[PDB]
């Protein structure tokens, strides 16, 4: 029923405002241990020699690497994504230039995606950055992905119960609930807010009085939007292992300046990054994946905050391999 004390608490606002983190040490410990499994950087190799655009046949993204550097990247990718199957997860064992296995073409695109995150989305990932591991954690299917309807368990390495399965209609409300930190909010914030850029998260007026022409009848947004935004925030909070005060002074959720933390601005960039990943890199992979990887509407699995963060405010507690793998970005 309960979590025994002591609680670890931080301060994220002016004294007397009850703003900050509230953490269970055993939980933090467990997540640190899981995340500590991040394989170390591979040893540095020879700088020096022909580029693989010359040496190999079908290199389209990493062509400027030396052979040693390139094969180092292939070793790293294998550890991070398909360590149990090895190189032949993506490659034809008798022809390494062949693109015949679907993971190969997906991986090329993921190389482009990863370089784009570390190059174009530094407003979010800073100099920490991401590798294949950040999401995949050693398996071809990342453990925390989203479809265009809620799915359970959140971690797809866990066996579902009958009621958790997406086909069992009686379990829908719980699938929704377990995506919004157990709330009864009747909204899927993934498809609403993170799959694409169609909706506005903000719902609160920035004036005291109602502006004429936007405040009556069909001029107005429905109150549902406010519930849906709350659902997104419950999800974001749970996805990062945190609460509203990490980012907001609840006095005024809609205000920036002294009323929001620096982390709130990083979160904002995070939403933008996720929409780009989903719209431009992940969703289009439905044409490359086997039917067995797709959801019930033919969608490829897509990313949310949890895909990388997995219950922690910085993914992997801020572990980085950025300087170890320059070929994953930032690209000059």
């Amino acid at each position: 029923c309960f979590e025994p004390p002591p609680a670890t608490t931080t301060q994220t606002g002016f004294r007397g405002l009850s703003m900050g983190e509230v953490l269970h040490p055993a939980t933090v410990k467990a997540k640190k241990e899981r995340d500590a499994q991040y394989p170390p950087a591979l040893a540095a190799v020879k700088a020096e020699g022909p580029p693989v655009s010359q040496v190999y046949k079908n290199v389209k993204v990493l062509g400027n690497l030396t052979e040693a550097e390139f094969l180092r990247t292939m070793t790293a990718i294998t550890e991070w994504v398909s360590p149990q199957e090895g190189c032949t997860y993506c490659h034809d064992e008798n022809n390494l230039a062949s693109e015949a296995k679907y993971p190969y073409v997906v991986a090329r695109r993921m190389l482009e995606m990863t370089r784009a995150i570390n190059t174009n989305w530094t407003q979010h990932v800073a100099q920490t950055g991401v590798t294949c591991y950040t999401c995949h954690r050693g398996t071809p299917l990342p453990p925390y992905v989203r479809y265009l309807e809620p799915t359970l368990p959140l971690n797809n390495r866990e066996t579902p119960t009958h009621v958790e399965r997406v086909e069992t209609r009686s379990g829908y409300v719980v699938r929704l609930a377990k995506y919004t930190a157990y709330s009864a909010l009747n909204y899927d914030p993934f498809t609403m807010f993170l799959a694409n850029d169609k909706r506005q998260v903000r719902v609160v007026p920035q004036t005291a009085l109602p502006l004429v022409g936007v405040s009556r009848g069909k001029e107005r947004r429905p109150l549902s939007d406010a519930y849906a935004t709350f659902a997104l925030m419950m999800s974001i909070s749970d996805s990062l292992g945190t609460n509203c005060t990490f980012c907001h002074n609840a006095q005024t959720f809609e205000s920036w300046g002294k009323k929001s933390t620096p982390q709130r601005a990083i979160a904002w960039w995070g939403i933008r990054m996720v929409r780009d990943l989903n719209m431009n890199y992940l969703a289009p992979l439905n044409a490359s994946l086997p039917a067995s990887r797709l959801g019930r509407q033919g969608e490829a699995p897509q990313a949310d905050c949890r895909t990388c963060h997995q219950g922690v405010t910085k993914p992997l507690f801020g572990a980085s391999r950025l300087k170890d793998y320059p070929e994953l970005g930032p690209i000059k």
Partner: protein
């Protein structure tokens, strides 16, 4: 210690009393029965109860609303009984999610909610008639009905009058345990933090005030139970030492005091004002204020605090920022 203030040590039994009303004496139903254990802390007699057209109508209308709600809840779990029982609190009947304005929404998206609200409203109106008319039948003033009217009015404010004033049924309260709760936050969010609505604050001072007053008054009566202070009607018409001592307890404590009649007016007023204040807040919300925090800022009232972590500009305003 006065053990009688804790429970009744020796309970009494006698023939059951019936006070005749101007009408409806023949519509009292039930054989009264006695609970010994209830009898320790209240009257042991349960029943009979009065039927009457308005109470019956209440039950017909209210049961209809409950059936609409429950059926929609059951559909939400695909009519699986185990999941219904498990998930009950999470289940709900929701106002329209799309903006149709004041258009009657589709049954799948708000229509059943509006229909349950219609039946609930009829049920509350019917019960109000019962509460009012029973007083009249028994030669009593209608003080309880008027207080009940303000509660009903508050429910109509959050149910249909605010929706009608801003012109959207999407703003109404859902039916359901957690879902009606989730609305509190949605609504507070939409209107810029209800802590900054002065009427929310008035309603809370009165609500807390009912706490204070019923603790203070209940305690006071128990404290003068040895003098029959619980017999408040004849203490009003013929002041006794019970209520002299009660008045003096408060006079000597806070410098002033009530009478045994007027303390009930204080309580009735405070109760009433919890609901009157709430209704006014709600009636101003969205109609004439869009963001209560910013309205307080406009009028110089809101507290401000130094930055702890660095002030953080809205990244949406940065040059080149995405939408």
């Amino acid at each position: 210690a006065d053990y009688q203030t804790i429970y009744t040590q020796i309970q009494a039994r006698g023939p059951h009393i019936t006070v005749s009303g101007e009408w409806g004496d023949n519509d009292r139903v039930g054989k009264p029965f006695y609970s010994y254990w209830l009898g320790k802390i209240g009257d042991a007699q349960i029943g009979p109860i009065y039927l009457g057209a308005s109470g019956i109508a209440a039950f017909a209308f209210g049961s209809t609303a409950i059936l609409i709600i429950l059926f929609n809840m059951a559909a939400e779990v695909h009519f699986d009984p185990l999941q219904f029982f498990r998930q009950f609190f999470w289940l709900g009947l929701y106002p329209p999610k799309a903006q149709y304005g004041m258009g009657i929404p589709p049954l799948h998206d708000g229509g059943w909610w509006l229909m349950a609200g219609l039946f609930m409203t009829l049920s509350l109106g019917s019960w109000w008639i019962r509460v009012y008319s029973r007083a009249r039948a028994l030669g009593l003033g209608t003080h309880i009905a008027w207080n009940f009217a303000a509660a009903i009015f508050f429910v109509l404010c959050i149910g249909c009058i605010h929706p009608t004033l801003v012109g959207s049924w999407s703003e109404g309260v859902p039916f359901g345990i957690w879902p009606h709760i989730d609305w509190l936050t949605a609504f507070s969010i939409r209107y810029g933090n209800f802590y900054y609505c002065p009427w929310h604050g008035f309603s809370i001072g009165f609500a807390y005030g009912c706490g204070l007053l019923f603790a203070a008054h209940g305690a006071t009566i128990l404290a003068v139970a040895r003098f029959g202070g619980d017999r408040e009607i004849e203490q009003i018409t013929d002041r006794g030492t019970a209520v002299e001592r009660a008045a003096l307890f408060w006079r000597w404590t806070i410098g002033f005091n009530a009478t045994i009649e007027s303390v009930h007016r204080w309580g009735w007023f405070f109760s009433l004002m919890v609901m009157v204040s709430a209704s006014v807040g709600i009636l101003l919300t969205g109609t004439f204020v869009d963001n209560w925090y910013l309205w307080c800022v406009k009028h110089g009232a809101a507290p401000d605090y130094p930055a702890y972590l660095p002030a953080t500009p809205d990244p949406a305003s940065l040059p080149g920022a995405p939408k």
